[PDB]
Amino acid sequence: ISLNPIQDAKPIDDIVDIMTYLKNGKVLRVKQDNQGDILVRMSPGKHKFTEVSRDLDKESFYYKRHWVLYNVSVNSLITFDVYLDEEYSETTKVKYPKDTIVEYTREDQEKDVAMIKEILTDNNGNYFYALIGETMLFDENKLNKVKD
Amino acid sequence: SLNYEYPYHPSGNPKHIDVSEIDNLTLADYGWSPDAVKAYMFGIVVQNPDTGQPMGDEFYNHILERAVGKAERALDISILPDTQHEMRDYHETEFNSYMFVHAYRKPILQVENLQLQFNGRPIYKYPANWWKVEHLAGHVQLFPTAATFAPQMIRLEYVSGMLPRKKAGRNKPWEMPPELEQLVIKYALKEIYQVWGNLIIGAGIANKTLEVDGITETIGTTQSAMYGGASAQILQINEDIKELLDGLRAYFGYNMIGL
Amino acid sequence: SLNYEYPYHPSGNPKHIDVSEIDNLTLADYGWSPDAVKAYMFGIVVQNPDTGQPMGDEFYNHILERAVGKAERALDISILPDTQHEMRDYHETEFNSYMFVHAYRKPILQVENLQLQFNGRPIYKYPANWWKVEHLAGHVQLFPTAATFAPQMIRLEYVSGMLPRKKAGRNKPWEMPPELEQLVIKYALKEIYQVWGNLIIGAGIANKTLEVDGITETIGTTQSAMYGGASAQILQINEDIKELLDGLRAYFGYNMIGL
Amino acid sequence: SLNYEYPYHPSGNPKHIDVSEIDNLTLADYGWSPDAVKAYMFGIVVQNPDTGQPMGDEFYNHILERAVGKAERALDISILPDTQHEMRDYHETEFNSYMFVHAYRKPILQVENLQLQFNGRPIYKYPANWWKVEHLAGHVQLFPTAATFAPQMIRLEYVSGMLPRKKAGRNKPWEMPPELEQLVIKYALKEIYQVWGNLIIGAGIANKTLEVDGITETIGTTQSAMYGGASAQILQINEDIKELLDGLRAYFGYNMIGL
Amino acid sequence: EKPYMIGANSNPNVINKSTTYTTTTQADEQDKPKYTTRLEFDTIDMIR
């Protein structure tokens, strides 16, 4: 009585794979710090050039994305996290993503910090959390995050 | 002597449209393309203000399909070609009047079958040459040669619609008049302007001015607390449709039913 | 000879919809997705100004459901496929008139059962081939082959509503015309604009101007004491709905009952 | 043969609601939650201006209870399920007409008792299978099988109300139509806007501007000497209710009494 | 199938929200546009 685990959108760190995907023409999504989230693409055909679109949704029959030529910078790619547009989605904006260290209350009334190794969902759309060293899956309300 | 497919007689109900071509014929054939809508909006581009996207052709087709649909009721018509399977009741007064029948949908391009049945078995199927049609009005009448009412006695099969016009400035009664093309276009534009009028400036902003370091920019739009941004054009389109629509009902005329 | 499921006769009351599929068919199949509403609002996006949260599809579906309900009242119609268990009285004059029956919910896709009962025990159940239907008007009439009134003598079971349109720009009498889709959309947009009109700038603000340190700005909204910010859009929606609704009533016609 | 609880016959007056569940059913079941009101006010927060307090859920419930009450009169209905103990007079003309009875409150979900008494002693209690009902209109009629008037001769017990709708976009005659949900909501919003409209700025302040050391702030609200702050929305809600309410009276129809 | 109902609220409470400061960075960006009417002088009429 549940739904299988949902993969998180893996950020891409290596520039080489980013450029290879771009050369293949696969769409990229760039999280700019100052001015929001944008799509990046390589122009099809012989006249190769980079294009940008702010039509920030999955392509649909009723919603076709418009692409403007832009001189995307290498430094922009390096300093800003980039995701494959096939993955990054509204489907699961989980409060505690995978590999995040979170604080959870154990049965012995002793707060411990563990890293989330697996996350899944159920019929109600809840976020079941798996923590290393324990089998029982916790809930959203029980957990807590520690920052800095 | 004469040569013809048995259902179709050149006299009375000459063949006009092949049954198979009914599927092929579409909106593009009648000139209802998105480009037509754009042409009437020559110099205007419908574009999102916050991103460079223009609205696609699919939306235009969706609107156009509803424009032609609205017209099909507004004048009681069947406009695109389609095949109809129609059952009708027996009324003695019309039956004695050469078996007069008023089809529910008009015009009638052609008639394939006209039979009388009792319990699904055809009691009598008339010769093809006997029956004759009035295409525009859709009257079906029979001219035989050498209680007072009952339900669903007869069975009628016919094709309702209009063919695309073959030659300029002219149309046969069985042929799409040019006005329906423009009328459906104007209905579509009423929707498109309703969308576009919100994208003139901002959202519901009538008057504006920026003054920066002695620079000054100032705009006052058509938008107002009691009038919409495109409502000037919408009003003019109503004045246009009223002239067009009334003048076209005179071509089809008023409906009548005996009682 | 002929082959058919016993309740359904191809002549008179041909089968149209499987009973099981009635549950499967949903608003999305008829095009009443939130996407369509958004398309009509292309270039306008609605958000809670205090957060980054736009309204989800839940609100849109909820609004659309009440919109299709409102249209269902605006014409005396059944607008989704739905089974009905109806008990009707015996009136002699209509009974002698081939057992004429005017169903409460129209159109009638198909008729499953039609029996005459006295105390819950079926006195007489008619042959399937005898009874015949008029889908759009919902008339049910009987054609037998080889005090003055009483209550709830006959028992009627039938399926009411409209199937989704199969072919472009066309519809059978048993088939949904595209405008009811559009009409419900426009009733939905009335609610949406009644929401969106409040959020353009703060609340209750008609005019504002702000000057700081040599930079100045002035804005005048469509809001006013006499009319709300979206009033222009709503009032144009009404102008279209009235035309759209008056024209569609001519497809169904006026209601009559003897006395 | 047939199986049923004695008061309830599947033919005529099938059981719909358990008596005990009458207490359980409440406003929340029909979707009249405060959250519903808030949803229609998406983006608006009703808050005291001089302190951070928002108005609580209790006020919404109190308003909603008066909204459903106002609707229950505005269309002569009993809307929530409740048990009725009704005495009615003997009129000969209706009595000879199969004992016709028009319940004071409608719809009738079901009938438990129908007895005739003289001085509190039941002279004759009819069999359950004899009597039959018309749920929506509330007509109660009797079909027996194998001075001119007197007061309070007969005794009637019945349950008046509507069940929450089970499936989307559809309702049985004994089932709450979606429009009443929206209608009661709109009545509630008329009250909430009347409260909120005073909290836009200050108290009865139309126009303002502060000029401090060359700083300038300026506001002009919807408030005016002849129009209230929320009166723009209230007017639009009246235009909405008029369309909704008139269209729903056609579902119930006009009342009639012989004389 | 089931009727579409509003249901309950989901937004949690947040306390002591801090302001957002635009981060300084040497990296390039793209300036998010607005497409709308432009005002210009009638230079021909200026010549006149």
Automatic annotation (TrEMBL), chain A:
<protein>
    <submittedName>
        <fullName>Uncharacterized protein</fullName>
    </submittedName>
</protein>
From TrEMBL, chains B, C, D:
<keyword id="KW-0862">Zinc</keyword>
<keyword id="KW-0479">Metal-binding</keyword>
<protein>
    <submittedName>
        <fullName>Neck protein</fullName>
    </submittedName>
</protein>
<feature type="binding site">
    <location>
        <position position="102"/>
    </location>
    <ligand>
        <name>Zn(2+)</name>
    </ligand>
</feature>
UniProtKB/TrEMBL annotation, chain E:
<protein>
    <submittedName>
        <fullName>Capsid protein</fullName>
    </submittedName>
</protein>
